[PDB]
Amino acid sequence: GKTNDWLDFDQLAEEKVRDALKPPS
Amino acid sequence: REKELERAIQVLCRRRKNNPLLVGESGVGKTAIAEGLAWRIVQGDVPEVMADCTIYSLDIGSLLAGTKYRGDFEKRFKALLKQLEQDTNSILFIDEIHTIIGAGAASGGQVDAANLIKPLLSSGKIRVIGSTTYQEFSNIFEKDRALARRFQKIDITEPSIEETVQIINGLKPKYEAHHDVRYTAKAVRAAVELAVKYINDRHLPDKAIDVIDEAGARARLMPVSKRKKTVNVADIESVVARIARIPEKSVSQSDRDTLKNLGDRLKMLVFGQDKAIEALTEAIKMARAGLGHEHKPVGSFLFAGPTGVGKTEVTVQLSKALGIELLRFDMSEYMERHTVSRLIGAPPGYVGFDQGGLLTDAVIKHPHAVLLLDEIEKA
Amino acid sequence: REKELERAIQVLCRRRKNNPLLVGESGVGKTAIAEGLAWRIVQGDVPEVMADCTIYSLDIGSLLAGTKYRGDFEKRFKALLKQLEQDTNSILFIDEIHTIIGAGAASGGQVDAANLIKPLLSSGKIRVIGSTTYQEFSNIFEKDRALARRFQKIDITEPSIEETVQIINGLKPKYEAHHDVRYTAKAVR
Amino acid sequence: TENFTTNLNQLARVGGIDPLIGREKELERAIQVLCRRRKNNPLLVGESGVGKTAIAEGLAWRIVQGDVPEVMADCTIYSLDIGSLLAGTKYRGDFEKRFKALLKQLEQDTNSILFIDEIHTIIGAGAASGGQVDAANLIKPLLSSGKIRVIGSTTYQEFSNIFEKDRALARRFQKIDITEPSIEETVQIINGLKPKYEAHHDVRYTAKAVRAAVELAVKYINDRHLPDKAIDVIDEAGARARLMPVSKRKKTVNVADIESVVARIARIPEKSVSQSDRDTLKNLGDRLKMLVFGQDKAIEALTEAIKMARAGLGHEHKPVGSFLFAGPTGVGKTEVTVQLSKALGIELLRFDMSEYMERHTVSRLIGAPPGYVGFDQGGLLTDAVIKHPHAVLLLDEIEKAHPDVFNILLQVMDNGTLTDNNGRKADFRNVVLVMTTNAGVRETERKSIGLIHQDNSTDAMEEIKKIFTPEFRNRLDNIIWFDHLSTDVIHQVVDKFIVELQVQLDQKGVSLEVSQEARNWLAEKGYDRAMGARPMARVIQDNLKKPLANELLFGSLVDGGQVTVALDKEKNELTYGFQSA
Amino acid sequence: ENFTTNLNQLARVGGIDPLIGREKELERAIQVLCRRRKNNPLLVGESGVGKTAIAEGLAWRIVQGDVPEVMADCTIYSLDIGSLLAGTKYRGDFEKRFKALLKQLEQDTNSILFIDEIHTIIGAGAASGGQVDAANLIKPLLSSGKIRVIGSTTYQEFSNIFEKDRALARRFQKIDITEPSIEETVQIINGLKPKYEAHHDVRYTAKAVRAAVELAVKYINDRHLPDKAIDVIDEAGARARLMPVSKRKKTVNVADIESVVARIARIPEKSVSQSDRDTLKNLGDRLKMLVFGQDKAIEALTEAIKMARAGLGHEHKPVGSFLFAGPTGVGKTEVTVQLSKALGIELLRFDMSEYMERHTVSRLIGAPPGYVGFDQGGLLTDAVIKHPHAVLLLDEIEKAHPDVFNILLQVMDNGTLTDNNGRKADFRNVVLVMTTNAGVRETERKSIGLIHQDNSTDAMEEIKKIFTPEFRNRLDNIIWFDHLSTDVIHQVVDKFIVELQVQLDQKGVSLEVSQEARNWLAEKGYDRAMGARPMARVIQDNLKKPLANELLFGSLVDGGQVTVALDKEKNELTYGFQS
Ligand SMILES: Nc1ncnc2c1ncn2[C@@H]1O[C@H](COP(=O)(O)OP(=O)(O)OP(O)(O)=S)[C@@H](O)[C@H]1O
Ligand SMILES: Nc1ncnc2c1ncn2[C@@H]1O[C@H](COP(=O)(O)OP(=O)(O)OP(O)(O)=S)[C@@H](O)[C@H]1O
Ligand SMILES: Nc1ncnc2c1ncn2[C@@H]1O[C@H](COP(=O)(O)OP(=O)(O)OP(O)(O)=S)[C@@H](O)[C@H]1O
Ligand SMILES: Nc1ncnc2c1ncn2[C@@H]1O[C@H](COP(=O)(O)OP(=O)(O)OP(O)(O)=S)[C@@H](O)[C@H]1O
Ligand SMILES: Nc1ncnc2c1ncn2[C@@H]1O[C@H](COP(=O)(O)OP(=O)(O)OP(O)(O)=S)[C@@H](O)[C@H]1O
Ligand SMILES: Nc1ncnc2c1ncn2[C@@H]1O[C@H](COP(=O)(O)OP(=O)(O)O)[C@@H](O)[C@H]1O
Ligand SMILES: Nc1ncnc2c1ncn2[C@@H]1O[C@H](COP(=O)(O)OP(=O)(O)O)[C@@H](O)[C@H]1O
Ligand SMILES: [Mg+2]
Ligand SMILES: [Mg+2]
Ligand SMILES: [Mg+2]
Ligand SMILES: [Mg+2]
Ligand SMILES: [Mg+2]
Ligand SMILES: [Mg+2]
């Protein structure tokens, strides 16, 4: 019997960034 | 659901970590138990302790709406918790609680909703009711041991046939009004029993309620005129037959004449070997007539003989006469033992796992069909 | 497609889980039945119960595009549901529904678009029509049994040769006028 | 900053917050670190449920009570709510000014300690869009100088995956490990906490109930640590009395109530089996014998094993019973198992081992390892037994599977625990592991080439040894060898199939009546000792089901009738008296 | 808008070169563009084919009027991906910019959007291009069909991003683009010749444009045929325009542009010159002058190579069919690199010993786990694809699995090796050579007889046995390397001494080697089985090892003047040390 082959699974990375505000006056 | 509810009240009345969790397979009415608790409170069936209590359903999507600025989600989350702590008699219900693990996450910040609520659950100031499936509870929720420790798992299991019929009787007035029809006592009994015997991959509460709901739309919308006010057992059988693709009581309909000519028609297309046609036509008749095994296929026949005598013709001409898909599988390909993976798919952690099994997927797509394994000896 | 349409109308009229899913191979009219349902509603071929209903074709790419924030998706998505929830007769059409299950609006988290509509579909508040291929239905779809439970499955089969030649005849005026040519009956066959 | 930080001493003074008992070594090391000149910032790292927050929060309770070293007296401990700091930090610098102002208060008094539970969260809090300015960088220069003292608490997973990533912050914090207490150390803790739980439920706990709760939880509740685990049994036990009527059992909760609560939490049968279950258990053998005949020896082993478990004589950590039902074909090996779960009303975990023929197929049972596509799916056997810990595990045709699969069951029978890919440990203590194999069927049914035919019964046993390693066979409770069905039991089997036929006909509205003479004819016609009783299922189908099917569809049996079967001695053939009625 | 430049407007005011040829490929675009549905053309071609020229040229027909009535008012806009992604700094801000342009174009009817390098914006996952998830904002317009888009994706990316994605493939019509014929290439340059001539103010010769294309594609071996010709022509005009301070040559010659190709190709001008026949005529004289020994073996190889380059026979078959067979250490490897260095082709060494396992054979066609990595492809296929003119050196071919031999038989017969990815490789211009160190064991085998003096001297028979008869028929002739003579070994020793002397010159240390010393090194460093292989180690241990000990400490630290001698009685080397 031929040897088995394993397949890896790569997870993508994406994140959300907050936003600070600066009033003019 | 008295046993399941009784444990919920016990957990909610605890000094600390009084946050019950409803973990069960999909379709077992986990949300119904949590939402139904509020319904019982109005009627007064619950004890005096649970009386004068309000149950709130959390909309995580709305909570995370318009929170682009820093600290917006924290303000909304810490504003709601203050309301619950101040009341001292309110209960929060979080449907699909596996979403709060990553809710409110920032680019690099780890300040999630679970981290903020965590110190309030162990203290016992607030009571939270969750509802997550086994798959989500293990892969996404069990991983956070700190949060899981503050919740008490309650295992919900699909009610028995005797219990499901009572559930439909209570829900029947809601479906009857919408569909302006009436369901007979035998119709409800048939839907539960037929669903278990034929409908698969769904749990009994959902399965039985699907047949009852779909049956109301059929009788209410299929006949343009001369509508049927009531819903007899014949209608429920057809609906189950469509969901599962095979009927159980239409055998004495026009299809009855097809079974009589099935043997004669096959003889015309395939001459000789009458003994083989008798085996196939009689097996189908017994299965359709209701004399089937109920735990085995319609028939398993090993046609052995010389080449060109009709082994692969009677089967091909049996599907055309019956109007069913032909699942032709050539066993000449499965020469080695390793070829079994192609039939049932590869196991987890190996290439081709997502592909699945050809035989399993084919049968799932066409449950009513003729499975032909040509040249089985070569395998 | 009266046989396929009849099954969809029966599901849409259900009290709960009235969210039919059109499952069929590529190029089998997966979206011709959803889009055509609106055509029937305007003409009036649909049953009286289905009259006064509006089909909405959601674009996941356009909605998901331009968020650049954690709460922008939920802000616009919930606004969409609010409109549908207000109109009890409104119906939503989500072409290529398999996209939301994989990664709707979150990566490295669990706040997906499907989870937002899971409680609404269970209560029958909104009607959703989905379209996904068999390959994208066994691998991507059905992994989250909760979402699969709400959506019913309508089997779509490739039409016969006699059915397609009749279909092309109905489409001949649109194609002929576009190209300003004529297609002989023999050529179509 | 009174809204962002609460004074634990004030809360502990007016009320009480989990009075700490013991932990002298843990608190002494923490006080030693807090008395250092630089980097005096202890970090209570431990598994969930080991009292991390109790040690930090209980330090304040000790200070007010007075059982603390003089150096630690006069000090105020504050708990930081990270959620309140980021409440209104919409504008730039609101978090920095708010956080920096808080630290100034601690430096002014120079006698205050800050408790930050879930300290792993502050590592990334405060970043607006792409900046590294956060609580970690804002506190970092103040921790290495010793100006302020901060107590931390975080789990190993969070500490290893998040806190340990920041080497700078980790260096400033002195990792103080917390170990799970012993059985004796836990009972004194419950005794100290008991006055707080008794007042909440207005009940009383006995000295034996506490000792039983700790011991019983450790045995069955194997998913949580001992301090929290034992308290769950105590807190939930008192709740039952409150819900129950004030007159029946509201005064106190006996030890019997403790075992009942633990049984429901672990989904296992409770001790002190009631008389209702005893009646079913006692009659289990008789009920099984009415559905399977000729295998009374196998039924005795299955029923006796279950009795030992309920009676309290079961194995400490092994399953209820491990058996390898070997024998001829069609002799009841799988029927007895399918009819055992129904009698007990438990789930049936049927596994077809004919699919696990390759070594790589083992990943389905224990799940794929981390870093692969199959990690989310998880093990099918570990997941199935976790949902139904009280069930019957059936491995049909285990010999067909690869020998590698047998090795997986070594710990299932010797220790009773199987470790899933995710790290969780399945429990097989209340699972009746049953295995069926047809090994030696060719050898036992073969005829020797000699004058004196030989008893090949002993050939299947030799094959069982070649296929199964001795370590696997030794773990089995006993190997039951099924015997061929005799002519006397075949008659009973015929009645069973005929009864099933009547159920099918009852649904259609027609009743079947078969004379005893016809039954004997069918038995002798389809009696095959080598092939078991499956041929009997086909002599009835061809003789009875086939004529009835034709009549049901085309005949008088369409409507409810009374069909009768008789045997004519002249021709020795079946006669079917169909009646329309 | 500012992001996109109107090609029609640009063509109206000039500045766009005309399109020559590509009628069959360009006409396909007009066909799909006029379609009611699925009218989004896709230009799938390799780099340098001129995909942008086809789009720019298409707009020229619209303004000129050589298009149907529907395409009269049509306007084509080229999207600038760089403008959108630049300055975003926020995943999603880029998407907002695309919507504004899309809304403006959607309002106007008969509008096209030429999205250059569309693969960069729609990459499946993390990419080194656009790095934006434009799948969200590409399927809606493609599905809507309001505006049609032209995509200049590459063959590689198309097989992965477009093929895997059903939505993209179902709304795109592939338009295969291939390199133009050599005869068509000169016609393209002739049409564009006046534009470049008017700029540089120089007139190119008809022979230069024809010869430039032949040597450009062969010697550069970097880009495709269309880009090379336009580059060399522009490069040649610039060089001659400013080569002299005052003088100038308006005319151009073949020898002039040849020097320009040498710089970009990094090859001497002599080899770059179109003198293949000259080098082939003196091939034997060059190899014999560069390397010594195996004169009979080298001469046979030159006659055979001349037969293939004559043009006779089937062109699809491979040019190189040579099986070297002799003891190693005699320069067998050196002739393979010297031959490539003289002809100018590259050198690709593939050792068979590494490719021994059955699984390793698959690597040549494709990597086992390389599902994401389809750019690399098979090890053998990628090297041949990138380098179509290079020698393939196979060592220890005798010790290979049977399946490996069949891979060589296929290319020898058909001349084309297929790839799992789908790339087509041609061995028509690739010379194939393989060496086998077989028969040396049989010769060196000690006879079982009593006298032990039995010599085989028939090693050629063993060569035919280790190889199947089928393989022998494909190869026209096998090369055999005779055993070297003791006199020839002396020259090999001097080679290592020269390198050592050069290395010592940087420190100011001399090295003197006696004639008797060389004899000791030759015998010690030459083995019958291994040949000159031990010479490297023998020279190092005898000469360099002691030297370092004294060079580190002793008289040899400074002054040099090293001397070597050997005692006659014991035959041991003694090196005198002088300060
Ligand atoms: N005890 C019950 N009483 C009334 N209805 C029930 C009960 N159990 C199940 N149902 C019905 O089961 C169907 C599904 O209920 P749900 O609350 O959606 O189930 P669920 O398991 O919580 O679903 P998720 O959230 O998708 S896992 C509804 O028709 C319920 O009314
Ligand atoms: N009894 C029959 N009646 C009519 N046509 C037949 C009959 N037997 C064979 N044929 C014809 O011969 C063809 C092949 O017969 P099959 O029964 O399909 O052969 P087979 O048994 O699959 O052969 P193998 O593969 O060699 S064992 C049919 O498709 C018919 O065209
Ligand atoms: N020595 C002790 N004295 C009193 N109670 C204790 C003691 N040790 C542990 N506990 C109990 O342990 C619990 C407090 O610790 P936990 O609730 O596990 O908090 P924690 O360790 O911060 O949790 P996570 O989940 O790891 S953040 C309460 O039930 C305490 O009564
Ligand atoms: N002792 C028995 N009593 C009653 N029915 C029996 C008995 N043995 C077999 N049967 C019938 O035969 C079938 C059960 O066969 P099994 O017990 O599953 O066979 P087995 O012993 O596992 O051997 P196989 O067929 O080689 S896997 C059902 O149809 C039963 O009704
Ligand atoms: N058939 C042709 N007719 C006329 N000019 C052509 C032709 N093919 C190529 N060219 C010229 O070669 C160039 C092709 O356009 P380019 O923009 O260089 O192509 P491209 O495929 O975008 O190149 P990259 O970016 O290097 S992959 C222009 O200088 C064209 O004038
Ligand atoms: N019943 C039908 N009547 C008319 N046109 C149809 C019908 N079924 C399919 N079509 C046409 O065939 C195509 C169907 O595409 P569709 O199946 O929606 O694509 P996809 O599978 O990629 O989602 C469209 O061009 C549509 O107009
Ligand atoms: N004919 C020769 N002339 C000069 N040096 C030679 C000759 N034959 C062998 N050599 C020496 O032996 C080496 C053998 O080739 P090399 O590439 O080093 O190793 P291999 O033979 O294993 O490929 C030459 O590089 C050179 O050092
Ligand atoms: Mg729910
Ligand atoms: Mg056949
Ligand atoms: Mg579509
Ligand atoms: Mg804590
Ligand atoms: Mg069995
Ligand atoms: Mg060499």
PDB file of N, CA, C and O in Angstrom, chain B residues 10 15-17 25 70-71 78 115 139 142 149 151 256 292 294 347 353, chain D residues 18 48 81 86-87 89 121 224 228 232 235 264 376-377 387 424 504 553:
ATOM      1  N   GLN B  10     -33.303  26.018  39.358  1.00  0.00           N
ATOM      2  CA  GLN B  10     -32.343  25.719  40.415  1.00  0.00           C
ATOM      3  C   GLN B  10     -31.038  26.469  40.194  1.00  0.00           C
ATOM      4  O   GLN B  10     -30.458  27.018  41.138  1.00  0.00           O
ATOM      5  N   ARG B  15     -26.399  31.003  44.501  1.00  0.00           N
ATOM      6  CA  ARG B  15     -25.746  32.172  45.079  1.00  0.00           C
ATOM      7  C   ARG B  15     -24.775  32.806  44.091  1.00  0.00           C
ATOM      8  O   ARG B  15     -24.751  34.031  43.937  1.00  0.00           O
ATOM      9  N   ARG B  16     -23.968  31.984  43.420  1.00  0.00           N
ATOM     10  CA  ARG B  16     -22.979  32.453  42.461  1.00  0.00           C
ATOM     11  C   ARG B  16     -23.010  31.559  41.232  1.00  0.00           C
ATOM     12  O   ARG B  16     -23.378  30.385  41.307  1.00  0.00           O
ATOM     13  N   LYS B  17     -22.614  32.136  40.097  1.00  0.00           N
ATOM     14  CA  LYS B  17     -22.593  31.429  38.817  1.00  0.00           C
ATOM     15  C   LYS B  17     -23.985  30.922  38.456  1.00  0.00           C
ATOM     16  O   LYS B  17     -24.152  29.809  37.953  1.00  0.00           O
ATOM     17  N   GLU B  25     -28.486  19.547  20.579  1.00  0.00           N
ATOM     18  CA  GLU B  25     -28.430  19.546  19.127  1.00  0.00           C
ATOM     19  C   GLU B  25     -29.474  20.505  18.563  1.00  0.00           C
ATOM     20  O   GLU B  25     -30.456  20.853  19.223  1.00  0.00           O
ATOM     21  N   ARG B  70     -13.638  54.279  19.428  1.00  0.00           N
ATOM     22  CA  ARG B  70     -13.123  53.552  20.579  1.00  0.00           C
ATOM     23  C   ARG B  70     -14.019  53.777  21.788  1.00  0.00           C
ATOM     24  O   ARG B  70     -14.452  54.900  22.063  1.00  0.00           O
ATOM     25  N   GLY B  71     -14.296  52.700  22.512  1.00  0.00           N
ATOM     26  CA  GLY B  71     -15.105  52.777  23.704  1.00  0.00           C
ATOM     27  C   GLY B  71     -16.601  52.822  23.489  1.00  0.00           C
ATOM     28  O   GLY B  71     -17.343  52.943  24.472  1.00  0.00           O
ATOM     29  N   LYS B  78     -21.528  47.963  29.110  1.00  0.00           N
ATOM     30  CA  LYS B  78     -21.531  48.255  30.536  1.00  0.00           C
ATOM     31  C   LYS B  78     -22.752  49.057  30.967  1.00  0.00           C
ATOM     32  O   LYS B  78     -22.971  49.217  32.172  1.00  0.00           O
ATOM     33  N   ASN B 115     -14.989  39.056  28.407  1.00  0.00           N
ATOM     34  CA  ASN B 115     -14.102  39.533  29.463  1.00  0.00           C
ATOM     35  C   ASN B 115     -14.808  40.522  30.382  1.00  0.00           C
ATOM     36  O   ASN B 115     -14.580  40.526  31.597  1.00  0.00           O
ATOM     37  N   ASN B 139     -16.128  23.694  20.038  1.00  0.00           N
ATOM     38  CA  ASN B 139     -15.092  24.336  19.239  1.00  0.00           C
ATOM     39  C   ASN B 139     -14.858  25.797  19.618  1.00  0.00           C
ATOM     40  O   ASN B 139     -13.713  26.261  19.595  1.00  0.00           O
ATOM     41  N   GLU B 142     -16.268  25.975  24.696  1.00  0.00           N
ATOM     42  CA  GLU B 142     -15.493  25.183  25.649  1.00  0.00           C
ATOM     43  C   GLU B 142     -14.036  25.634  25.719  1.00  0.00           C
ATOM     44  O   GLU B 142     -13.388  25.463  26.758  1.00  0.00           O
ATOM     45  N   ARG B 149     -16.692  28.077  32.969  1.00  0.00           N
ATOM     46  CA  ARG B 149     -16.803  27.805  34.398  1.00  0.00           C
ATOM     47  C   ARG B 149     -17.928  28.607  35.035  1.00  0.00           C
ATOM     48  O   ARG B 149     -18.524  28.164  36.023  1.00  0.00           O
ATOM     49  N   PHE B 151     -20.778  29.222  33.669  1.00  0.00           N
ATOM     50  CA  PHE B 151     -22.040  28.747  33.127  1.00  0.00           C
ATOM     51  C   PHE B 151     -22.233  27.293  33.531  1.00  0.00           C
ATOM     52  O   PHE B 151     -21.264  26.552  33.721  1.00  0.00           O
ATOM     53  N   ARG B 256     -50.206   1.802  -8.654  1.00  0.00           N
ATOM     54  CA  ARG B 256     -50.545   0.395  -8.465  1.00  0.00           C
ATOM     55  C   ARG B 256     -50.483  -0.361  -9.785  1.00  0.00           C
ATOM     56  O   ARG B 256     -49.969  -1.484  -9.846  1.00  0.00           O
ATOM     57  N   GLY B 292     -41.985  -4.299   4.238  1.00  0.00           N
ATOM     58  CA  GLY B 292     -40.543  -4.215   4.229  1.00  0.00           C
ATOM     59  C   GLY B 292     -39.920  -4.590   5.558  1.00  0.00           C
ATOM     60  O   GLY B 292     -40.578  -4.734   6.589  1.00  0.00           O
ATOM     61  N   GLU B 294     -37.807  -2.726   7.267  1.00  0.00           N
ATOM     62  CA  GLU B 294     -37.766  -1.466   8.020  1.00  0.00           C
ATOM     63  C   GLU B 294     -36.377  -1.215   8.600  1.00  0.00           C
ATOM     64  O   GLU B 294     -36.174  -0.176   9.241  1.00  0.00           O
ATOM     65  N   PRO B 347     -10.655  10.506   5.730  1.00  0.00           N
ATOM     66  CA  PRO B 347     -10.888  10.891   7.117  1.00  0.00           C
ATOM     67  C   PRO B 347     -10.389  12.299   7.384  1.00  0.00           C
ATOM     68  O   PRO B 347      -9.729  12.902   6.525  1.00  0.00           O
ATOM     69  N   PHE B 353     -10.490  15.391   2.179  1.00  0.00           N
ATOM     70  CA  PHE B 353     -11.487  15.271   3.236  1.00  0.00           C
ATOM     71  C   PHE B 353     -12.761  16.027   2.882  1.00  0.00           C
ATOM     72  O   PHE B 353     -13.870  15.520   3.092  1.00  0.00           O
TER      73      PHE B 353
ATOM     74  N   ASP D  18     -16.172  35.965  49.569  1.00  0.00           N
ATOM     75  CA  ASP D  18     -15.477  34.680  49.544  1.00  0.00           C
ATOM     76  C   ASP D  18     -14.350  34.575  50.569  1.00  0.00           C
ATOM     77  O   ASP D  18     -13.176  34.637  50.179  1.00  0.00           O
ATOM     78  N   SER D  48      -8.333  27.841  35.785  1.00  0.00           N
ATOM     79  CA  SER D  48      -9.627  28.348  36.222  1.00  0.00           C
ATOM     80  C   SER D  48     -10.181  27.488  37.352  1.00  0.00           C
ATOM     81  O   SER D  48     -10.150  26.257  37.282  1.00  0.00           O
ATOM     82  N   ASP D  81     -11.741  47.891  36.711  1.00  0.00           N
ATOM     83  CA  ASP D  81     -12.746  47.490  35.731  1.00  0.00           C
ATOM     84  C   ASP D  81     -12.292  48.100  34.411  1.00  0.00           C
ATOM     85  O   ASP D  81     -12.484  49.295  34.169  1.00  0.00           O
ATOM     86  N   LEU D  86     -12.728  52.421  29.336  1.00  0.00           N
ATOM     87  CA  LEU D  86     -13.042  52.652  27.936  1.00  0.00           C
ATOM     88  C   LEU D  86     -14.515  52.977  27.712  1.00  0.00           C
ATOM     89  O   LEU D  86     -15.019  52.785  26.604  1.00  0.00           O
ATOM     90  N   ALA D  87     -15.224  53.445  28.740  1.00  0.00           N
ATOM     91  CA  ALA D  87     -16.642  53.745  28.579  1.00  0.00           C
ATOM     92  C   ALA D  87     -16.861  54.889  27.595  1.00  0.00           C
ATOM     93  O   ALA D  87     -17.519  54.718  26.563  1.00  0.00           O
ATOM     94  N   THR D  89     -14.285  56.818  26.035  1.00  0.00           N
ATOM     95  CA  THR D  89     -13.015  57.196  25.412  1.00  0.00           C
ATOM     96  C   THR D  89     -13.171  57.329  23.895  1.00  0.00           C
ATOM     97  O   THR D  89     -12.477  56.691  23.106  1.00  0.00           O
ATOM     98  N   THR D 121      -6.018  41.292  29.087  1.00  0.00           N
ATOM     99  CA  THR D 121      -6.788  42.203  28.245  1.00  0.00           C
ATOM    100  C   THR D 121      -6.103  43.554  28.052  1.00  0.00           C
ATOM    101  O   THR D 121      -6.138  44.114  26.950  1.00  0.00           O
ATOM    102  N   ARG D 224     -13.751  20.197  35.476  1.00  0.00           N
ATOM    103  CA  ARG D 224     -13.452  21.425  36.200  1.00  0.00           C
ATOM    104  C   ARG D 224     -12.564  21.121  37.398  1.00  0.00           C
ATOM    105  O   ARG D 224     -12.495  19.987  37.878  1.00  0.00           O
ATOM    106  N   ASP D 228     -13.881  25.098  42.566  1.00  0.00           N
ATOM    107  CA  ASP D 228     -15.130  25.537  41.954  1.00  0.00           C
ATOM    108  C   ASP D 228     -16.080  24.364  41.761  1.00  0.00           C
ATOM    109  O   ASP D 228     -17.295  24.500  41.941  1.00  0.00           O
ATOM    110  N   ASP D 232     -19.972  24.017  43.231  1.00  0.00           N
ATOM    111  CA  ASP D 232     -21.124  23.912  42.342  1.00  0.00           C
ATOM    112  C   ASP D 232     -22.123  22.891  42.867  1.00  0.00           C
ATOM    113  O   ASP D 232     -23.339  23.108  42.808  1.00  0.00           O
ATOM    114  N   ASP D 235     -23.712  24.619  46.078  1.00  0.00           N
ATOM    115  CA  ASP D 235     -24.619  25.715  45.750  1.00  0.00           C
ATOM    116  C   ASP D 235     -25.875  25.210  45.051  1.00  0.00           C
ATOM    117  O   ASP D 235     -26.986  25.658  45.355  1.00  0.00           O
ATOM    118  N   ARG D 264     -27.040  14.332  37.866  1.00  0.00           N
ATOM    119  CA  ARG D 264     -27.649  15.114  36.796  1.00  0.00           C
ATOM    120  C   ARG D 264     -26.604  15.940  36.059  1.00  0.00           C
ATOM    121  O   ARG D 264     -26.689  16.115  34.838  1.00  0.00           O
ATOM    122  N   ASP D 376     -11.861  21.247  13.201  1.00  0.00           N
ATOM    123  CA  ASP D 376     -13.175  21.727  13.621  1.00  0.00           C
ATOM    124  C   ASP D 376     -14.174  20.589  13.795  1.00  0.00           C
ATOM    125  O   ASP D 376     -15.017  20.635  14.697  1.00  0.00           O
ATOM    126  N   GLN D 377     -14.109  19.569  12.935  1.00  0.00           N
ATOM    127  CA  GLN D 377     -15.061  18.464  13.013  1.00  0.00           C
ATOM    128  C   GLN D 377     -14.968  17.732  14.346  1.00  0.00           C
ATOM    129  O   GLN D 377     -15.987  17.460  14.989  1.00  0.00           O
ATOM    130  N   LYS D 387     -21.723  13.449  24.550  1.00  0.00           N
ATOM    131  CA  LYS D 387     -23.131  13.823  24.580  1.00  0.00           C
ATOM    132  C   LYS D 387     -23.973  12.755  25.260  1.00  0.00           C
ATOM    133  O   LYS D 387     -24.973  13.080  25.911  1.00  0.00           O
ATOM    134  N   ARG D 424      -9.743  17.379  25.281  1.00  0.00           N
ATOM    135  CA  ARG D 424     -10.735  16.922  26.241  1.00  0.00           C
ATOM    136  C   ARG D 424     -10.654  15.407  26.387  1.00  0.00           C
ATOM    137  O   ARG D 424     -10.227  14.697  25.474  1.00  0.00           O
ATOM    138  N   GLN D 504     -46.755  -5.025  10.826  1.00  0.00           N
ATOM    139  CA  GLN D 504     -46.826  -4.410   9.507  1.00  0.00           C
ATOM    140  C   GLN D 504     -48.239  -4.489   8.953  1.00  0.00           C
ATOM    141  O   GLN D 504     -48.750  -3.521   8.378  1.00  0.00           O
ATOM    142  N   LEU D 553     -52.080  -5.068  -2.786  1.00  0.00           N
ATOM    143  CA  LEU D 553     -52.151  -4.166  -3.928  1.00  0.00           C
ATOM    144  C   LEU D 553     -53.231  -4.608  -4.908  1.00  0.00           C
ATOM    145  O   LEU D 553     -54.049  -3.795  -5.347  1.00  0.00           O
TER     146      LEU D 553
END
